[PDB]
Ligand binder design. Sequence first.
Ligand SMILES: O=C(O)Cc1coc2cc(Oc3ccccc3)ccc12
Length: 188
Amino acid sequence: AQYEDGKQYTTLEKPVAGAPQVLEFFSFFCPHCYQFEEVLHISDNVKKKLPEGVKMTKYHVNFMGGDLGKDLTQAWAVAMALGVEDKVTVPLFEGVQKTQTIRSASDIRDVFINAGIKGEEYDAAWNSFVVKSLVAQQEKAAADVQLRGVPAMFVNGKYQLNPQGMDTSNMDVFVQQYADTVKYLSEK
Ligand SMILES: O=C(O)Cc1coc2cc(Oc3ccccc3)ccc12
C-alpha cells in the first residue's frame, strides 16, 4: 500500500480509548519541535487538512530538561488554562533554545509578563489546582504510550506518525506528507 505500517506511521500495540482525535507532544527543549513551530508550522498545516472543528490537543512533556522541563510542563498548563498558548509558544522556544535566557521558573514567568499576562493572574494559575490537574492530564497522556521521543503525534489514540519515513530534502514536501498522513489516519 501507499501508506504502510512502519513507513509513514506505526500502530500502537495497546490502543488508548478516549484520546483526542489529534494529540501532539512536544518539549520546549526539543530541536525538531522548535522547527515544527517556527519553520514548518506543522499544527496549522495539519489543521488545514482536517475537517472544520476537529479537536487538536498539544501537551508538553517532562523528560527533557530536568527541573526546568517539569517547570515548563506546569507553565504550559498555565498557558492552556489562560488560553495564551499562541502568545507564549515562540518566546518560550526562543528563550530555551535560541537566547538561552530561560534558566529558572522566574525566567519562565518573565516570558508571560512580557507577553502581557498579569503577574497576579500568572501566579494564581501557577498555584491553582486546575493547573495541577492539567499537569496530571499531560503526564497521563504521555504515560499511556511510554513516550520517549518528541515531536510526536497520535491519531484517534491508535496511530503514531513516523516522520523518520518522510522526505526531508524539501521542507514543504515533508509538511505535506505529514499532514496528508494525519488526514489518511483520521479517515481510518
Ligand atoms: O527524528 C527524525 O528523523 C524525525 C523528524 C522529526 O521531526 C523532523 C523534522 C525535520 O526537519 C526537516 C528539515 C528539512 C526538511 C524537512 C524537514 C527532519 C526530521 C524530523
